Every structure is written in structure tokens, then in C-alpha cells.
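Tutorial sheet, problem 5. The two components below are modelled jointly, 632 residues in total.
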Amino acid sequence: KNSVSVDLPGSMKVLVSKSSNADGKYDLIATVDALELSGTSDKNNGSGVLEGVKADASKVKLTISDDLGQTTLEVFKSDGSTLVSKKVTSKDKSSTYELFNEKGELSAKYITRADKSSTYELFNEKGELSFKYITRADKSSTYELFNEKGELSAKYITRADKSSTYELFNEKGELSAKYITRADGTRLEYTGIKSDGSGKAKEVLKGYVLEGTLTAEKTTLVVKEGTVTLSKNISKSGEVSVELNDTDSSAATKKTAAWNSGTSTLTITVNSKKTKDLVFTSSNTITVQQYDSNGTSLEGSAVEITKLDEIKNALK
Amino acid sequence: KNSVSVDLPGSMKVLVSKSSNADGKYDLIATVDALELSGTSDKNNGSGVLEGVKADASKVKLTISDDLGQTTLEVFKSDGSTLVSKKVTSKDKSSTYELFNEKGELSAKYITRADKSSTYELFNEKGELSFKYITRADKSSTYELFNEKGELSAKYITRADKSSTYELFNEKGELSAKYITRADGTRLEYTGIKSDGSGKAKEVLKGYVLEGTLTAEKTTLVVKEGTVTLSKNISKSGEVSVELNDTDSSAATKKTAAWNSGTSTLTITVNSKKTKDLVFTSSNTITVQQYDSNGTSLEGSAVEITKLDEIKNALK
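Model answer (C-alpha cells):
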């Protein structure tokens, strides 16, 4: 009887007999699940086919490749044809796992790649994808809900940075709404999104919200006070730029502004003097600081804005 | 320009003038998104109705009850009657939030209670529930997926201790499969579940698996060695108990056993001597420890079983 043993992909062990049988082949034994499997092989390395029959007549089949590079574990009904499950594991620790219904067709499928990223897919009665979960190397997680046409109904994404994205889709599976919650709890909300990617935009900050529009390229959020319009643009990416336009025609009172991307600061000028800096911080806040009477140096300290009225006051 | 701030349920604030008007009424100002609402009231306490119209002609209405006990915030389309959103909040910290699609019909409903027990519901075009998310006070999360017709097809529960339950339901709404993953990664798997609650059971432990049956009253997992049958029962209510029968008729060799539910221990006897204790531990492991030749005291130390063959050896 007793000889040596061999580790296999998927945390299984096979015992391989010393000495050959009547065909010059080696006996193989492995206990997998609650079942002792047995087989014979050409080789003495632990590769080959082992089989067993469970108490309920299910047929089990473990196939170990010649180089020990992979294992396939199949469970069939009495038939020996219709699958119950199928697990293919690589020496990577990478693996596929398929679960079948009593028709012998795919109910669910789990994949994990070498880099630790994985998919779970749940199929329905119609052999159609109902839900899907995807994990990537960047430690993001995606949850996808499908309608009875296999189009997206909803999608939820969580990221490493602690932010999330929740997407809702219309009857045709086109994106209709998108809600982005930043790590800090501030939000960008897009609604009424059309087939060209245009829509309504809202940014939810601490103490106030900005509203505006979405287009293919950018998000433009707008604050208006009298003749002055302030626009905060947020890139197709995630980049902030800011501009100001004043329809005031009098050179004594007309506001203009310069944007400095490097410092995230809009500097307002009136009548050839700088009047204030608006800083758009990495904390998703806005600060305001006034210049001195020469429009030369900054005066006092920057003040954090806490409501929309204060932005408007700064634009007067 | 001479008001007081009044804090309102749903984390809002309202400004009230303490000076009357051409009706004996007071002025109300509040900001919701980037919209200034206004209204007037009999009362000077911050209660009443505030309204506003957005740039896109959306109608906004804030209703504050007389005792400041409840706020209702409604957003309507330009027609002033089809709902875009509706948020009802009580001072009890409880809230309901309803979101409607471009259509004007209920898309999503979010209910929060005082303890943070909250329910999120997502509806399809047919007015039917597609998905539900329920969090409780105990830190547990439930995810419910519904079919076309809007009845449960899959349910995923996560508890505080990192354990989970995953349930799959058939076309008829009946539970067909159920997978319990314990905090420590051991699993109970129930498959082919019939209309009477009976089915196939598998317990997946560290290093081995046990199989058996599910009936309405219990799960019975069995290991057989020679004439000996060991049965691990897991009751409807989750209580583990253990039994052994030996068909051997000789007093010299027949195993009998006693189960002590207080110590989670099966003591085996042969020929009037205790031979070993099998402990079924809180970590979902089995240990084995032999008695001395008197059957009086345990010898050595308890040994953790790691493979099915070791259970069978203990039964020899």
C-alpha cells in the first residue's frame, strides 16, 4: 500500500504508489471534499486522473496536468455528463469555479487572477447575467446590477481613496444619473444625463451647494451676483479651473480675474488693483483673502467660506 | 435684515424676522441647494412654508411644522406638481427620502430610523422592486436582489463578526440553496433544497469536509468507518450535538458514546472503559484525546484533527 505524497494546486494532496501495476502504471489516492478518489497514471509524479462516486451517485473527477501546472475538479450528476461544479486551479493560486443548476447549465462563476483581482457573476433562469462583482489590483470594488435585457440597471463602485460612485441607468441601459461621494463626504451629483453625456450638475460641499451643467468635456458650476459670473470648471478628469466674467462696462468697477492653476487661486482685479484671492483648496473648500489698499500684498488672514451668500458677497 | 437662526430637523436652518407684515406675518429665509427660499408665517418661531424657483423653473417647497417637529422638502418640475424629490424628516432623527425619475414616478426610496436602521429601495420602470439594501443597529448589512416580477431571487447578509449568509431562490420563490460563511471562513452549504425544507448538506472545515442531509428539524453530517457511524447534528436553532452508533455486537470491541452538551464533548467507550474524548470546539475544529488504560484519566494532550482520515482513525 503506502508510499509518498505530493502537494497540488488548489490545496490538495495526492498519494502516489511506489511500484507499478499490471500496466506499468502507478496508483493514485486523494481525499477531496468528503470523498476518497483513486486513479492510475503513466507517471509517478502525482499527475493523472482520479475518480470517485459519492454516496448519492455523483461522479467526481480530479484531473492533474502532467507538469503539475493545473488541477481540474469536476462534480457530475449520476449521468457522468451533467456538471454540478467545476474548479480549475493554477499553480499560481489563480482559479476558476463554476456552479451549475439542475439543468446542468451555469448558475454562477467565480474567477480569481494571480494578482488577487476577481470576478463573481450570477446568472438567472434565462442564462443571462443578473449581478456581477469585480475586484481589481487597485483595491477598487464594482457591483453591477442588470435588467432582464442584460443592460445595466445600476452600478456601485468603491475605491482605495475611500470615495464611491453610484450610477443609475435608464430603460435603454444609458447612464442617466451619477453620484460621486468623495472621501471627505463632499459630492458631485449628475442627473438628467442625455445620450450626448450632457446633464445637470450639483456639487455638495460643507455649508453650501453649487449648481450648473455637465457636458461631454466638463462640469461647469456657476455663481452669479449682479453683473458678475463665477464659474468653477471641473475637468473630464477631476481638475479644477475657475474663471470670472463681469458685464460691468465701467473701468472703475469692472471685475476681472486671473487663474493660477499651480496655487489653485483666482485673483480678482478691479480698476488696476488686485482686490482678493479666492483659493479653491484640496479640502474642497473656498477661502477668501483681501489685498491691501495698493492691491499689492495680502491683508489679514484667509477666511474659509461657509455659505453661498459669502461667495456672492465676494463677487460684489 | 434683523432675524434669528432656528435649527430644524433634517440639518437645516431658517432665518425669521422678529417684526410683522401687512397681514401680521413674519419673514422666512432658508437656503436648500443653491436656492434661496422665502415665505411668510403667522408665527415667529421658524415654522411655515418657504418656496423658491430654480433657474431651470423647478419648484422648491419647504414645509416646517408649527412645533418644529417635522420638515418636508419637495422639489417639483416646472409644472409645480410632478415630484423630482421629497424628503420628510422628524426631530426623532428619522427620515424618508424619495427620488423620482425624469418620468415623475418613484425611482428610489431611502428610510432612516433613530438608531441608524436604514432601508434603501431601488425600483424599475414597471414600478417593481429591483434591489433592496437594509442596514441595522447591530452593524449588519442585507442585500436583496429581485427578479423580473419583483420577488426575491438572491439575498446576501453580512454580520458584524464578518460572517455571511448567501441565499438563492427558485422561480417559485422557494429557497433552493444557502451558503453560510462563518467568521473564521468555515462554511455550511445547503443545496437542492425542496419545498419541505429538506436538502443536501456539506460543512467545509479547515482541512476536511463533512457531508449529510438537511431536514426541517436538523442538519445531520456523517462519517462512517467500518461498523461505526458518527453523526454531527446541527439543530434548526444552531445547537450542535453528536452521536455514534456501532453495529458491532461484541462487548470486546463495540464503541458506544455519550454527548455532554455542556462541554461540547463526545466520550467514546469500549468494553466498559472510556477510550477517547472528541471535543467540538468554538473554533469549528475537532480535537481528540485518549484516556489511559484504566479509562479513568486523559493522557497526553488534546490533538486537533486536520483531515477526514484522522476522524475515521478515531472511530476504529
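Marking note: The longest strand of chain A covers residues 83-90. Full credit if you identified this.
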